[PDB]
């Protein structure tokens, strides 16, 4: 037994790269910043990522929507090393949806079709950004 | 003599299969999750969901409105035997919708052309989701 | 000399029929529930709105914005009347918008085209809404 | 050594003319009231934006966005000195979309393709608004 516990939104830190948490629901997509990283997400080239992640959006309220993981221990190795902030990655985690999110995951009433984790650059002021 | 108190949000518990009340107005939709419950809501295949429950969209603010109910008693039973949370239906209750929600109801100028409580299904971590 | 001072969210009162400011920009549109009225609001079949009733929509923040009236003492006076509230209306008010409003609002510049008072109908529980 | 400053929402007045921060992303954009200033910006017919100019868009959470600003000084001079409020532009400074700007950001992955400073009018009352 364990618990779900919160990421928070302090391990998205500014001037550095961002992972992006894309999900296609089953017309309906939902974009959001997931974690801040010093360098990109490689994958294995054999694996997807859906063999070390699951996901589970759920709602909270009659307006406000969650979404749970499970992370392999792979991913969860890989994801502490690649963080700009001290390894904040638990094998059970959630991260809520603020109200405009939540009603796009409510209206495609959760059914999650796809999802991946991208790479996002940085850009111009980046450096200057992070070292201020 | 009476009041209409607040179905709170708390009556929703992640990982539980939920009741949506959906709500088109006369173009304009709403969906809403409604309640978190133990099986799914089978009515009379007799009777329709208005005989029980009528529903009135208000307004509450410049920006904001609510949702008004009268649970006539079969379901106000049925739904608390339903529910995930301790008996939480009275007859009388009202929600309110969010900012974002709120405008839908006030853009179709709250005229409720049709509504009903669709049953959704629990996700792959749900289980695992409620037992923590 | 005088200020703007604000109508409230308090002015609207559920279970009564709704004054709505509707308002075209230069494409953009805003509804937003004004006042709770008693009966509803005739004027005058030679008079428009726009002699005793100008706006100005002005930006608050860097996502906020508000509107700004100027009631002549007619209106003034007609509205107090029709009122649920007890006489709230003064010749220099102002009301804010919401983060999703206000946007609206910014995108087309604030440029008002058109603007009106629409009565809007009560609602089948209304009666017993405003009598709790 | 340095730390980009936030521009508050203060630095808007309602009443006065307004420079409206517009930015395309690479279908998504997104338009800012900057500040409220008391004439015009006209740049040297010479010059673009862009020069004194440089602009990033950051996520600072899973559902928030920021934009960083660097403002080189001929700008800092012309900016302090056309504002309404008491001179609030710093070399180094940025400002705060709310959660409905932020996701457009998001969505688009911060990627500016254009942006531009803008001159937008008072309106009917502001004469009269800001005297108050
Ligand atoms: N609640 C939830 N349902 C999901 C998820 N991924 C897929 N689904 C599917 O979505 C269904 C609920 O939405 P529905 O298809 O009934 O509108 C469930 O039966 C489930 O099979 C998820 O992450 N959360
Ligand atoms: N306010 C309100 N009006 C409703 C509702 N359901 C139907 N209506 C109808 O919507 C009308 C108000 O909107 P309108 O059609 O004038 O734009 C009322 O006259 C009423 O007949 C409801 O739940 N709330
Ligand atoms: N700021 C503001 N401008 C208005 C209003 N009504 C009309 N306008 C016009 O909108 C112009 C500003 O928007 P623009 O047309 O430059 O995008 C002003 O020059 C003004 O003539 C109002 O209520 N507020
Ligand atoms: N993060 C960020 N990226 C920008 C900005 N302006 C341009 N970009 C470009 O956007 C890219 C990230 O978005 P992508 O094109 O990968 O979806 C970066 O590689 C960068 O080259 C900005 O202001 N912020
Ligand atoms: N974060 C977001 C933003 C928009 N969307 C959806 O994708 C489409 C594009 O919406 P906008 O035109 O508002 O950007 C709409 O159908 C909207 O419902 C989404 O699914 N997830
Ligand atoms: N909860 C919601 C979400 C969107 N809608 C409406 O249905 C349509 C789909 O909107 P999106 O493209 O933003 O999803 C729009 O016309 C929007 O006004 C609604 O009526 N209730
Ligand atoms: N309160 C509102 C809501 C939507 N709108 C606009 O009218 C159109 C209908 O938007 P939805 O499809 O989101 O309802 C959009 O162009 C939107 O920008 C508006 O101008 N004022
Ligand atoms: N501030 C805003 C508002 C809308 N938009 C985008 O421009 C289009 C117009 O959206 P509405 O119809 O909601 O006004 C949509 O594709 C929306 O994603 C934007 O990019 N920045």
Avoid: C
Avoid at 4 to 31: H, R, S
Avoid at 69 to 92: A, E, G, H
């Amino acid at each position: 037994k364990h618990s779900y516990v919160e990421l928070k939104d302090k391990v998205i830190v500014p001037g550095w790269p961002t992972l992006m948490l894309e999900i296609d629901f089953v017309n309906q997509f939902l974009n959001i910043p997931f974690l801040s990283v010093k360098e990109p997400l490689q994958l294995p080239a054999e694996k997807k990522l859906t063999d070390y992640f699951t996901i589970d959006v759920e709602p909270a309220g009659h307006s406000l929507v969650n979404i749970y993981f499970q992370i392999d221990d792979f991913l969860l190795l890989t994801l502490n090393s690649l963080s700009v902030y001290k390894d904040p990655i638990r094998k059970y985690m959630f991260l809520r949806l603020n109200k405009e999110q939540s009603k796009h995951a409510i209206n495609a009433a959760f059914n999650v079709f796809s999802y991946r984790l991208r790479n996002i650059g940085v850009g111009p002021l980046g450096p200057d950004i992070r070292s201020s």
